[PDB]
Amino acid sequence: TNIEAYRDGLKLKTEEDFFACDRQYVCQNYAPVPVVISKGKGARVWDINGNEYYDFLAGVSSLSQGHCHPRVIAALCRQAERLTLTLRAFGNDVTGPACRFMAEMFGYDRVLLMNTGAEAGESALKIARKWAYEVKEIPPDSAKVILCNNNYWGRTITACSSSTTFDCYNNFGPFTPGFELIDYDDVGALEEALKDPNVAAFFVEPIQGEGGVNVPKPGYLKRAHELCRSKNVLLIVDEIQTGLCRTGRLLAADHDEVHPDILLLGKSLSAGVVPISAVMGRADVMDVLKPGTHGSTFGGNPLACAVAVEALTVLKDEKLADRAERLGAQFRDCLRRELYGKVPWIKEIRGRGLLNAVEVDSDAIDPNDVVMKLKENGILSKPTRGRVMRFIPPLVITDEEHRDATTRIIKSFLAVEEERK
Amino acid sequence: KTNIEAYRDGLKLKTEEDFFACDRQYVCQNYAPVPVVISKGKGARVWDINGNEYYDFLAGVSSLSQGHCHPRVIAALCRQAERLTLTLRAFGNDVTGPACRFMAEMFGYDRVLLMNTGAEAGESALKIARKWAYEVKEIPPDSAKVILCNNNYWGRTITACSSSTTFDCYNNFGPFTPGFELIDYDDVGALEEALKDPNVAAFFVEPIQGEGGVNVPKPGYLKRAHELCRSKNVLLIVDEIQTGLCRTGRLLAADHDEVHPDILLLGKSLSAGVVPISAVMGRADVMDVLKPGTHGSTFGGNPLACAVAVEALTVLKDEKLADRAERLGAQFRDCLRRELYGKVPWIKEIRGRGLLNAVEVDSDAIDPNDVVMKLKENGILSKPTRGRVMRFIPPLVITDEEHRDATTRIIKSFLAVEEER
Ligand SMILES: Cc1ncc(COP(=O)(O)O)c(CNc2cccc(C(=O)O)c2)c1O
Numbered sequence: 001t002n003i004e005a006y007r008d009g010l011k012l013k014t015e016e017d018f019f020a021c022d023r024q025y026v027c028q029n030y031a032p033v034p035v036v037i038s039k040g041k042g043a044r045v046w047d048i049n050g051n052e053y054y055d056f057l058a059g060v061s062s063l064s065q066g067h068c069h070p071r072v073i074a075a076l077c078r079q080a081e082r083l084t085l086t087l088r089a090f091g092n093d094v095t096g097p098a099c100r101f102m103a104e105m106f107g108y109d110r111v112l113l114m115n116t117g118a119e120a121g122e123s124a125l126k127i128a129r130k131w132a133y134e135v136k137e138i139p140p141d142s143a144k145v146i147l148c149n150n151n152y153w154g155r156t157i158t159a160c161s162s163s164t165t166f167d168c169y170n171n172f173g174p175f176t177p178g179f180e181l182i183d184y185d186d187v188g189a190l191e192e193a194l195k196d197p198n199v200a201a202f203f204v205e206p207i208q209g210e211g212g213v214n215v216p217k218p219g220y221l222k223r224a225h226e227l228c229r230s231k232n233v234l235l236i237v238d239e240i241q242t243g244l245c246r247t248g249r250l251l252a253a254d255h256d257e258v259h260p261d262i263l264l265l266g267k268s269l270s271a272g273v274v275p276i277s278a279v280m281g282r283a284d285v286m287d288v289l290k291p292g293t294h295g296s297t298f299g300g301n302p303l304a305c306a307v308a309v310e311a312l313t314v315l316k317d318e319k320l321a322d323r324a325e326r327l328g329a330q331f332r333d334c335l336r337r338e339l340y341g342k343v344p345w346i347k348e349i350r351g352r353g354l355l356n357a358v359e360v361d362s363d364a365i366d367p368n369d370v371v372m373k374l375k376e377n378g379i380l381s382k383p384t385r386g387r388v389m390r391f392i393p394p395l396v397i398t399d400e401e402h403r404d405a406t407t408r409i410i411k412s413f414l415a416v417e418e419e420r421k
Numbered sequence: 422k423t424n425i426e427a428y429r430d431g432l433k434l435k436t437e438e439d440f441f442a443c444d445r446q447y448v449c450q451n452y453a454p455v456p457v458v459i460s461k462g463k464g465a466r467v468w469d470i471n472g473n474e475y476y477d478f479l480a481g482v483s484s485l486s487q488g489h490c491h492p493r494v495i496a497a498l499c500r501q502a503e504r505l506t507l508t509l510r511a512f513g514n515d516v517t518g519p520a521c522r523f524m525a526e527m528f529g530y531d532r533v534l535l536m537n538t539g540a541e542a543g544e545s546a547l548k549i550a551r552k553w554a555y556e557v558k559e560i561p562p563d564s565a566k567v568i569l570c571n572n573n574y575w576g577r578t579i580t581a582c583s584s585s586t587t588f589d590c591y592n593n594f595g596p597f598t599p600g601f602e603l604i605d606y607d608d609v610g611a612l613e614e615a616l617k618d619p620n621v622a623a624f625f626v627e628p629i630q631g632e633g634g635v636n637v638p639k640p641g642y643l644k645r646a647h648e649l650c651r652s653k654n655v656l657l658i659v660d661e662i663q664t665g666l667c668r669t670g671r672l673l674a675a676d677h678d679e680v681h682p683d684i685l686l687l688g689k690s691l692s693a694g695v696v697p698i699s700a701v702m703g704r705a706d707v708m709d710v711l712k713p714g715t716h717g718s719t720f721g722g723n724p725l726a727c728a729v730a731v732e733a734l735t736v737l738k739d740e741k742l743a744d745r746a747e748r749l750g751a752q753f754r755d756c757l758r759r760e761l762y763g764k765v766p767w768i769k770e771i772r773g774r775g776l777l778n779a780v781e782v783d784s785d786a787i788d789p790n791d792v793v794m795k796l797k798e799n800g801i802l803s804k805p806t807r808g809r810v811m812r813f814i815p816p817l818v819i820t821d822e823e824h825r826d827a828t829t830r831i832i833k834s835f836l837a838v839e840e841e842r
């Protein structure tokens with residue numbers, strides 16, 4: 001095909017030829033790990049030279065079903081031969097059924113399909129504001145949304161406007177008003193912010209992802225929902241990264257028996273095959289989005305819908321929540337046993353399910369040394385905030401793969417410590 | 422059977438009304454009722470669930486320029502989908518760089534930022550312009566301004582709403598992102614005056630306003646605008662998401678004025694309607710303001726979408742679709758004017774370039790929907806904008822025979838609505 005033929009013509013032999021090509025022609029807004037992946041299957045990827053690795057980033061939990069899951073790829077190919085795009089201006093025979101499927105699986109009245117996690121967040125903020133103005137009857141332009149320090153929900157200007165991460169906002173203003181930032185995992189701070197009747201919503205992650213896999217204290221989300229409910233404030237829960245079995249439950253919010261007022265999904269909603277995200281809520285909230293007040297060219301396209309229904313079904317059929325729960329407990333147990341004390345520059349091993357992190361003291365060690373040693377030992381990962389090592393494999397990783405990978409990971413932390421000595 | 426097929430079979434949705442009802446119950450109701458339930462598409466044609474054939478004259482608002490399910494593009498999709506779909510830009514791969522090079526060389530830019538949707542392309546361009554203005558122009562903090570035009574459309578994020586003049590796009594979605602100056606479209610004088618503000622970072626403009634009504638500006642508009650922007654060291658951001666990629670009879674609609682945009686946005690037919698991928702392209706000293714960590718997207722640049730995009734772009738060139746668009750579109754406008762002007766009094770204007778065409782009607786003298794229904798009776802699927810602007814945006818691959826046929830059907834519909842009057 002044309003990508004293959006064009007690439008051959010470039011005579012890109014070596015990994016360096018590819019790194020040079022990316023440096024010259026790709027906008028340079030990433031610092032990637034120096035690997036050139038050519039193939040993925042399940043928990044494994046291979047580089048252009050045939051070297052094999054375990055993928056411990058998995059799209060930051062977009063590939064929970066594994067790379068190239070055969071059922072999902074089969075669903076993609078079948079629908080792609082039939083119909084990929086109509087626009088929501090025309091009906092089709094896929095979008096409604098796919099939304100009913102989701103509505104039933106997650107227990108919501110209405111489903112809005114968008115393409116990216118950022119777009120889901122923007123949509124939820126629009127819905128929460130317009131509901132606050134039209135149903136709560138707060139004063140025009142006065143709506144406030146509470147978010148948490150170190151949150152991450154995307155890269156739009158409005159997302160940058162509600163970030164506390166310097167590189168995410170700096171020099172991208174002037175900023176969208178109407179946000180109140182409070183500490184994460186702080187019910188007292190939330191209760192205080194909820195005294196303002198102009199608050200429309202509290203927008204929160206059940207575990208902060210990009211912020212460092214910050215797992216809150218027992219009861220946090222349960223407590224937050226009760227506080228919000230008492231003030232008629234919507235709880236918007238971002239499950240784009242934590243959702244869909246990654247933490248050992250269908251939604252991370254299930255750990256607290258919380259049914260979000262507005263749910264966001266994305267990432268593994270498509271098994272990492274095509275971009276599709278969802279916003280779900282009750283009718284009297286979602287129906288504020290009247291005809292013409294919101295839209296998206298590709299949102300709810302039939303190809304993505306067909307893929308999402310298959311991706312969702314795989315999670316259930318393969319009992320991936322149970323896998324995540326069991327393997328992740330084993331992961332944290334092994335790492336704590338073998339690394340705590342032995343490695344003094346480990347600050348904390350934390351997580352839920354197969355969303356795990358190892359926080360290192362970046363004054364005591366170069367975190368990039370840990371990254372490169374992991375890669376030498378067959379493990380691909382990328383930290384967040386420099387020092388938070390992340391371990392987010394596909395949930396389909398087998399028992400034997402996970403044991404092998406765990407051994408390689410422990411061996412790598414020990415090899416970096418040995419080098420420090 | 423794949424999961425969507427099996428699930429849908431269980432719902433026992435027999436009629437078009439069964440589908441409309443499913444949509445009303447489970448899908449967020451932000452689009453108006455649809456006339457039709459499409460099941461398949463091939464080229465310029467679609468078929469409903471009952472096997473009735475129609476010509477698609479919306480084509481995803483120019484996302485399906487290559488036709489529904491173009492076999493090369495679907496083959497490219499399927500091939501890459503078996504190999505690798507997502508790595509994140511945290512890791513290298515053997516597709517993203519070559520695809521970016523392909524695009525850089527095709528459009529004449531140093532650097533290519535790949536995002537997923539048109540709105541995300543616009544958001545990203547505005548972030549680039551702002552950060553560039555702060556860092557290279559050295560304007561004061563938070564003072565950056567962007568000039569855009571009344572009736573502009575670039576998406577549905579809060580920042581897009583913040584810069585809209587369309588009531589249903591912004592109403593009750595504030596408070597709004599500051600920093601926008603709105604001027605009339607197709608008004609060089611108004612632009613010149615707005616450019617007296619030294620805090621202006623960019624002028625953001627469509628070569629033909631799309632959703633605003635297929636508003637074709639006067640001779641020289643974009644040429645004159647670029648010269649004014651250059652005089653003041655202001656970036657010209659040209660949104661070619663709807664007008665680009667051969668739709669108007671040239672590779673870029675900006676080519677009509679020999680304008681090379683400082684920042685170019687592409688989207689829509691970049692993927693032939695198969696998956697969401699958009700692009701922001703610019704020179705190195707503008708695009709390089711997006712340093713590592715200052716911008717990102719989970720799915721942006723994914724290898725599946727890159728493979729598709731290269732195939733989709735190659736089809737536009739191989740099938741000489743700009744030439745096709747130029748020739749057929751001139752035929753379309755000539756036949757409509759010769760058969761409808763003078764004979765139909767409630768037609769205000771027939772306008773367009775290439776195969777981006779509209780017929781504006783006087784909504785006080787006719788009901789625009791009667792035109793839309795008659796079109797559908799005659800096998801033409803279309804959706805107006807702003808109620809009274811009928812749009813004729815077929816795939817560029819529409820054959821000589823099919824285009825002659827559709828032209829006749831379209832004339833027949835207008836004349837039959839007048840005969841009913
Ligand atoms: C909780 C959460 N919400 C929203 C988003 C945004 O999704 P999109 O990326 O689809 O707009 C995320 C994204 N998560 C994520 C985490 C780390 C890096 C990157 C990256 O863009 O390189 C993305 C996330 O982790």
Ligand SMILES: Cc1ncc(COP(=O)(O)O)c(CNc2cccc(C(=O)O)c2)c1O
Pocket residue numbers: 087088089295296297298482538539540541543574575576577627631632660661662663664688689
């Ligand atoms: C010129 C232009 N720019 C940006 C966008 C936004 O692209 P996304 O939709 O991929 O975010 C468009 C979109 N064009 C368009 C026109 C009419 C309706 C709809 C709809 O979402 O139903 C979209 C457009 O026409």
